[PDB]
Amino acid sequence: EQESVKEFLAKAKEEFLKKWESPSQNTAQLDHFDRIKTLGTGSFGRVMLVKHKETGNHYAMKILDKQKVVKLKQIEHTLNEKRILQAVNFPFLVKLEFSFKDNSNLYMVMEYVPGGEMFSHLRRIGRFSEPHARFYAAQIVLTFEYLHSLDLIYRDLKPENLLIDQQGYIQVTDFGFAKRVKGRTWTLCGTPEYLAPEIILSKGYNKAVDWWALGVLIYEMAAGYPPFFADQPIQIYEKIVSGKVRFPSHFSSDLKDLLRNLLQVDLTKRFGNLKNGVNDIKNHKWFATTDWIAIYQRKVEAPFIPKFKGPGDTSNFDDYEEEEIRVSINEKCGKEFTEF
Ligand SMILES: O=C(O)c1ccc([N+](=O)[O-])cc1
């Protein structure tokens, strides 16, 4: 509770609110960019590496098909995503550089993070050592302290959404489920292995779901697999709600203790959601070696620098069928996306 942290977060919230209340809109257009490669694809959108034709800068352009967003009931989520991203500012949050829309699609032009997904690195090495997991975890703790102070819940923590930058630090990406919430919210969203019990059980839930997800992430980083793994979602959900977790014997006692407090089924007893808030996590013995300010200032040497050749190198991302970016002659779903 150092006044220094209080004053930092008060300024952070002031700056967020000014942008939140007057969002930027329509700051580029599609023909300002060349398409390079598809980096990922989903049921209503895609991410493509693009290059700005005048500056030469590379970006990750997320393209969402308006009709599919509507069909999959993602309108509000998409509006949340863009309004939040244009208003936030933190060292471990990916930057939204431009946004715009056309007759068919919504576009969010993000910084490109060439090291690829944490998930790929984790799966290639098997598991991270505790110091390595702790370095990433510390960045997530600080990022959640920031987001939660702004009344934002992230709701999609998982290794695929954490990209590794040129200095070996995290960039949190994919704000598709992020939401500004005072009090409780109810939507079923997230990824199965990372869902808190109160989401599975259809309760009104709060920021404590992000702290649960951090427990899942730390476990998965340190073990190589998530704590509630099973072959089918229903089996995963049964394990999540059960109140039981098994730890590998290689985990330190401090790690097990922290994880029991993050993976606490009773949200009213979960670290990050008690009277001392984030400080119960920051002051835990597992984080005793963490210099929180040095992490924030990016002065700690990272566990590894991803291997890549330059800002246009796509070698840490995988290969997808290349599909057209078609723009209809007629405006689709204009009313739904007026504010974008
Ligand atoms: O926020 C996102 O969804 C996002 C996805 C991918 C990348 N990227 O590939 O750098 C950046 C942001």
Side-chain angles (χ1 to χ4, degrees), residues 253-274 276-285:
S253 295
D254 293 335
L255 176 54
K256 294 186 285 191
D257 186 83
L258 175 61
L259 293 175
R260 290 184 198 279
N261 285 290
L262 292 170
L263 301 173
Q264 171 52 255
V265 169
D266 181 344
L267 65 88
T268 75
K269 297 183 181 189
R270 187 179 305 144
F271 270 24
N273 200 43
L274 309 181
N276 282 317
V278 71
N279 295 328
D280 289 327
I281 301 168
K282 292 167 93 176
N283 290 334
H284 190 276
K285 194 170 175 300

